[PDB]
Amino acid sequence: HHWGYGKHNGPEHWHKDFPIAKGERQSPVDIDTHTAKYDPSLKPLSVSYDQATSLRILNNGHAFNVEFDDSQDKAVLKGGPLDGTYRLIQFHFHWGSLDGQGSEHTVDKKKYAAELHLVHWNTKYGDFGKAVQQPDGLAVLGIFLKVGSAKPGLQKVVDVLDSIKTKGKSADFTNFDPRGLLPESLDYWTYPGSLTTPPLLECVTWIVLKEPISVSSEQVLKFRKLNFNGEGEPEELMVDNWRPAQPLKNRQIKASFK
Ligand SMILES: [Zn+2]
């Protein structure tokens, strides 16, 4: 039936409806730190989120998205391995049922408790829908979350989850500053990949930050209280909405640091 993360519709079944799942530039991957090539020609990332305008938070049945106004160049990513300007459209997370799993990318096979994805689209394409059809249409910043100390800047998010518990619910979510979600260092790994959920288009330049941010156990617990199901349907907790690492195939992972 429709795709999800259960036994009968999970990642291992996606290829039936989305043949691109067994493609040549599928994401996530395992980051082998000894095989990643330091590339001194890569520029530092430029994150200009001071004018970010968030609008809403939504439970789409597979995660929760915080959406931003992308009608102008207010929150953009540029530099790094990118050419042009990429506008932030939304951010979301992938998490697990336990603290030992949840991230999509792994580092030397280490899994983190969750992974944040900031999704950006290449402004030369005019809109998000056109951008997904191009090899350089999107740039996704990925940030790992480890459990330790609470992240103050994440609390506003945590607090509104009760109101979007089931699929299709949404809530006004204005004046949220995504700068509160960044690690101190912007060192990163980069590779050409895809979206990690259907339709799995190979249109992403991945930018994975080396430094994880910490969240408290209690903050992550609140994530695990969301539901995959819609209101009045049997309860299925929203946990383990992560795709396992895919084959690197013909790709090189580059590092911005040594
Ligand atoms: Zn994602």
CSV table of C-alpha atoms and ligand atoms in Angstrom, one decimal:
chain,number,residue,atom,x,y,z
A,1,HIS,CA,0.0,0.0,0.0
A,2,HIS,CA,1.7,3.4,0.7
A,3,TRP,CA,5.3,3.5,1.8
A,4,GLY,CA,6.4,4.0,5.4
A,5,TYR,CA,8.8,2.4,7.8
A,6,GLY,CA,6.9,-0.7,8.9
A,7,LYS,CA,7.7,-4.4,8.1
A,8,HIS,CA,5.3,-4.5,5.1
A,9,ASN,CA,6.0,-1.1,3.6
A,10,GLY,CA,9.5,-0.2,4.8
A,11,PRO,CA,12.7,0.8,3.0
A,12,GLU,CA,13.2,-2.7,1.7
A,13,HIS,CA,10.0,-2.5,-0.3
A,14,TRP,CA,10.4,1.0,-1.8
A,15,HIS,CA,12.0,-0.1,-5.0
A,16,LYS,CA,8.7,-1.7,-6.2
A,17,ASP,CA,7.0,1.8,-6.5
A,18,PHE,CA,10.3,3.9,-6.8
A,19,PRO,CA,12.8,1.9,-9.0
A,20,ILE,CA,15.3,4.7,-8.4
A,21,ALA,CA,15.7,3.3,-4.9
A,22,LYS,CA,18.4,1.0,-6.4
A,23,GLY,CA,20.0,3.9,-8.3
A,24,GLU,CA,23.6,4.9,-8.6
A,25,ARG,CA,23.5,8.0,-6.3
A,26,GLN,CA,21.2,6.9,-3.4
A,27,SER,CA,21.3,8.3,0.2
A,28,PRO,CA,22.1,8.0,3.1
A,29,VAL,CA,25.6,6.4,3.1
A,30,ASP,CA,28.2,5.4,5.7
A,31,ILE,CA,30.9,8.1,6.0
A,32,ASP,CA,34.3,6.2,6.2
A,33,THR,CA,36.5,8.9,7.7
A,34,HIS,CA,39.8,7.3,6.6
A,35,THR,CA,38.6,7.2,3.0
A,36,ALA,CA,37.1,10.6,2.7
A,37,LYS,CA,39.4,12.9,0.7
A,38,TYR,CA,40.4,16.3,2.2
A,39,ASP,CA,39.7,18.8,-0.6
A,40,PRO,CA,41.4,22.1,0.0
A,41,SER,CA,39.6,23.7,-2.9
A,42,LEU,CA,36.2,23.5,-1.1
A,43,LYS,CA,35.2,26.8,0.4
A,44,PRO,CA,33.6,27.4,3.8
A,45,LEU,CA,29.9,27.2,4.0
A,46,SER,CA,27.9,30.5,4.2
A,47,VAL,CA,24.7,30.2,6.3
A,48,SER,CA,22.7,33.4,6.3
A,49,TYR,CA,19.6,32.7,8.4
A,50,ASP,CA,19.2,36.0,10.1
A,51,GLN,CA,16.1,36.9,8.0
A,52,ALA,CA,14.5,33.4,8.3
A,53,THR,CA,10.7,33.5,8.4
A,54,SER,CA,9.2,30.3,9.8
A,55,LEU,CA,5.5,29.8,9.2
A,56,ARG,CA,4.2,26.5,10.2
A,57,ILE,CA,4.9,23.0,11.6
A,58,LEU,CA,3.2,20.0,10.1
A,59,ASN,CA,2.9,16.2,10.8
A,60,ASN,CA,3.0,14.7,7.3
A,61,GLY,CA,2.7,11.2,8.5
A,62,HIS,CA,6.5,10.4,8.1
A,63,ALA,CA,8.1,13.2,10.2
A,64,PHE,CA,7.3,16.8,11.3
A,65,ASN,CA,8.3,19.6,9.0
A,66,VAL,CA,8.9,23.3,10.1
A,67,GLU,CA,8.3,25.3,6.9
A,68,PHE,CA,9.7,28.7,6.0
A,69,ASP,CA,8.7,31.5,3.6
A,70,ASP,CA,10.9,30.8,0.5
A,71,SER,CA,9.3,33.5,-1.7
A,72,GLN,CA,12.5,35.6,-1.4
A,73,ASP,CA,16.2,35.2,-0.4
A,74,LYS,CA,15.7,35.4,3.4
A,75,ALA,CA,17.3,32.2,4.6
A,76,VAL,CA,20.0,30.9,2.3
A,77,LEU,CA,22.9,28.6,2.0
A,78,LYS,CA,25.8,29.2,-0.4
A,79,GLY,CA,29.6,28.5,-0.6
A,80,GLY,CA,31.0,25.1,0.4
A,81,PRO,CA,30.7,22.9,-2.7
A,82,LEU,CA,27.7,24.9,-4.1
A,83,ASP,CA,27.3,27.2,-7.1
A,84,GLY,CA,24.5,29.7,-6.6
A,85,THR,CA,22.1,30.4,-3.8
A,86,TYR,CA,19.9,27.8,-2.1
A,87,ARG,CA,16.8,29.0,-0.2
A,88,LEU,CA,15.7,27.1,3.0
A,89,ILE,CA,12.3,25.6,2.5
A,90,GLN,CA,11.8,23.3,5.5
A,91,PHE,CA,13.7,21.3,8.2
A,92,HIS,CA,12.7,17.9,9.8
A,93,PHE,CA,14.4,15.1,11.7
A,94,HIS,CA,14.8,11.3,11.5
A,95,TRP,CA,15.0,9.5,14.9
A,96,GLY,CA,14.9,6.2,16.5
A,97,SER,CA,13.0,4.1,19.1
A,98,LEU,CA,16.2,4.0,21.2
A,99,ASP,CA,19.1,6.3,21.7
A,100,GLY,CA,21.5,3.9,19.8
A,101,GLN,CA,19.8,4.4,16.4
A,102,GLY,CA,17.9,7.1,14.5
A,103,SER,CA,20.4,8.8,12.2
A,104,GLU,CA,20.4,8.1,8.4
A,105,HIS,CA,24.1,8.8,7.7
A,106,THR,CA,26.6,7.0,9.9
A,107,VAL,CA,30.2,7.9,10.6
A,108,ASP,CA,32.6,4.8,10.6
A,109,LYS,CA,29.4,2.8,11.2
A,110,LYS,CA,28.4,4.9,14.3
A,111,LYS,CA,24.7,5.7,14.4
A,112,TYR,CA,23.5,8.8,16.3
A,113,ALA,CA,20.1,9.2,18.1
A,114,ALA,CA,18.7,11.4,15.3
A,115,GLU,CA,19.6,13.5,12.3
A,116,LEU,CA,18.3,17.0,11.4
A,117,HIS,CA,17.9,17.9,7.8
A,118,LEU,CA,17.7,21.5,6.6
A,119,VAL,CA,16.3,21.4,3.0
A,120,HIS,CA,17.3,24.1,0.4
A,121,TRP,CA,16.5,24.5,-3.3
A,122,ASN,CA,18.6,26.1,-6.0
A,123,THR,CA,17.1,29.4,-6.9
A,124,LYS,CA,18.1,29.2,-10.6
A,125,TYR,CA,15.2,26.7,-10.9
A,126,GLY,CA,12.5,29.2,-9.7
A,127,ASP,CA,10.6,26.7,-7.5
A,128,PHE,CA,11.1,23.6,-5.4
A,129,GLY,CA,9.2,21.3,-7.8
A,130,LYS,CA,11.5,22.3,-10.7
A,131,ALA,CA,14.6,22.0,-8.5
A,132,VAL,CA,13.9,18.3,-7.6
A,133,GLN,CA,14.2,17.4,-11.3
A,134,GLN,CA,17.8,18.6,-11.6
A,135,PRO,CA,21.1,17.0,-10.5
A,136,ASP,CA,22.1,20.1,-8.5
A,137,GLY,CA,18.6,21.1,-7.5
A,138,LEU,CA,18.8,20.8,-3.7
A,139,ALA,CA,21.4,21.2,-0.9
A,140,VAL,CA,20.6,19.4,2.4
A,141,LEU,CA,22.6,20.2,5.5
A,142,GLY,CA,22.6,17.2,7.8
A,143,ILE,CA,23.4,17.5,11.6
A,144,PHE,CA,23.7,14.6,14.0
A,145,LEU,CA,22.1,14.7,17.4
A,146,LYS,CA,23.6,12.8,20.4
A,147,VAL,CA,21.9,12.5,23.8
A,148,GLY,CA,23.6,14.5,26.5
A,149,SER,CA,22.8,18.1,27.5
A,150,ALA,CA,19.6,19.8,26.4
A,151,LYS,CA,19.7,22.1,23.4
A,152,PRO,CA,17.8,25.3,24.5
A,153,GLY,CA,17.1,26.4,20.9
A,154,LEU,CA,15.2,23.1,20.3
A,155,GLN,CA,12.7,23.6,23.1
A,156,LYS,CA,10.2,25.7,21.1
A,157,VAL,CA,9.9,22.8,18.7
A,158,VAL,CA,9.6,20.2,21.4
A,159,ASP,CA,6.8,22.1,23.1
A,160,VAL,CA,4.5,22.3,20.1
A,161,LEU,CA,4.6,18.6,19.2
A,162,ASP,CA,1.5,17.8,21.4
A,163,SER,CA,-0.6,19.9,19.0
A,164,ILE,CA,0.5,18.0,15.8
A,165,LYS,CA,0.4,14.5,17.3
A,166,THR,CA,-1.3,12.8,14.2
A,167,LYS,CA,-0.9,12.9,10.5
A,168,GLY,CA,-2.3,15.9,8.7
A,169,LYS,CA,-2.2,18.2,11.8
A,170,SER,CA,-0.5,21.5,11.5
A,171,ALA,CA,0.1,24.6,13.7
A,172,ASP,CA,1.2,28.2,13.2
A,173,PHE,CA,4.9,28.3,14.1
A,174,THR,CA,6.3,31.8,13.6
A,175,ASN,CA,9.5,33.6,14.7
A,176,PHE,CA,11.6,30.3,15.1
A,177,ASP,CA,15.3,31.0,14.5
A,178,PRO,CA,17.1,28.0,13.1
A,179,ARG,CA,20.5,29.4,14.1
A,180,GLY,CA,19.7,27.9,17.5
A,181,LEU,CA,20.2,24.4,15.9
A,182,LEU,CA,23.8,24.8,14.5
A,183,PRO,CA,26.9,23.3,16.1
A,184,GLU,CA,29.8,25.6,16.8
A,185,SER,CA,31.9,24.3,13.9
A,186,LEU,CA,30.8,24.2,10.2
A,187,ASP,CA,33.4,21.6,9.1
A,188,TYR,CA,31.7,19.1,6.8
A,189,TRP,CA,31.8,16.1,4.4
A,190,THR,CA,30.0,16.4,1.0
A,191,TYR,CA,28.9,13.9,-1.6
A,192,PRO,CA,26.3,13.8,-4.4
A,193,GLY,CA,23.2,11.9,-3.3
A,194,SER,CA,19.4,11.7,-3.2
A,195,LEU,CA,16.3,12.4,-1.0
A,196,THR,CA,16.1,9.7,1.6
A,197,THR,CA,12.3,9.3,1.3
A,198,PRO,CA,10.2,8.6,-1.8
A,199,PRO,CA,10.4,9.8,-4.5
A,200,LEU,CA,14.1,9.3,-3.8
A,201,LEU,CA,15.2,11.7,-6.5
A,202,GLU,CA,18.9,12.0,-7.1
A,203,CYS,CA,19.0,15.8,-6.9
A,204,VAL,CA,20.9,16.5,-3.7
A,205,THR,CA,24.3,17.8,-2.8
A,206,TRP,CA,24.7,16.5,0.8
A,207,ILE,CA,26.5,18.7,3.3
A,208,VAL,CA,27.0,16.6,6.6
A,209,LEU,CA,28.5,18.5,9.5
A,210,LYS,CA,31.2,16.7,11.5
A,211,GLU,CA,30.2,18.1,14.8
A,212,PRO,CA,26.9,16.8,16.4
A,213,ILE,CA,24.7,18.9,18.6
A,214,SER,CA,23.5,17.5,22.0
A,215,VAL,CA,19.9,17.0,23.0
A,216,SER,CA,18.6,15.8,26.4
A,217,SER,CA,17.0,12.4,26.7
A,218,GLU,CA,13.7,14.2,27.6
A,219,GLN,CA,13.8,16.3,24.4
A,220,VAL,CA,14.2,13.1,22.2
A,221,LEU,CA,11.5,11.3,24.2
A,222,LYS,CA,9.0,13.9,23.1
A,223,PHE,CA,9.7,13.1,19.4
A,224,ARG,CA,8.8,9.4,20.0
A,225,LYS,CA,5.3,10.5,21.2
A,226,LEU,CA,4.2,11.5,17.7
A,227,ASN,CA,2.1,9.3,15.6
A,228,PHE,CA,2.4,7.9,12.0
A,229,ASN,CA,-1.4,7.5,12.0
A,230,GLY,CA,-4.2,10.1,11.5
A,231,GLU,CA,-6.6,11.0,14.3
A,232,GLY,CA,-9.1,8.3,15.2
A,233,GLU,CA,-6.9,5.5,13.7
A,234,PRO,CA,-5.1,2.9,15.7
A,235,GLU,CA,-1.9,4.3,17.3
A,236,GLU,CA,1.5,3.7,15.7
A,237,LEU,CA,4.3,5.7,17.3
A,238,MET,CA,6.5,7.8,15.0
A,239,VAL,CA,9.9,6.1,15.6
A,240,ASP,CA,12.6,4.7,13.4
A,241,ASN,CA,11.7,6.9,10.4
A,242,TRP,CA,15.3,6.4,9.0
A,243,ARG,CA,16.5,4.7,5.8
A,244,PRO,CA,19.6,2.4,6.2
A,245,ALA,CA,22.8,3.3,4.5
A,246,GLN,CA,23.0,2.6,0.8
A,247,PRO,CA,26.0,1.5,-1.4
A,248,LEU,CA,28.4,4.3,-2.2
A,249,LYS,CA,29.0,2.9,-5.7
A,250,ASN,CA,30.9,5.3,-8.0
A,251,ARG,CA,31.2,8.1,-5.5
A,252,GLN,CA,33.8,10.0,-3.5
A,253,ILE,CA,33.1,11.6,-0.1
A,254,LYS,CA,35.1,14.9,0.2
A,255,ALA,CA,36.0,16.6,3.5
A,256,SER,CA,36.4,20.3,4.2
A,257,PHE,CA,38.9,19.6,6.9
A,258,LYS,CA,41.8,17.4,7.9
B,1,ZN,ZN,15.3,13.9,5.9
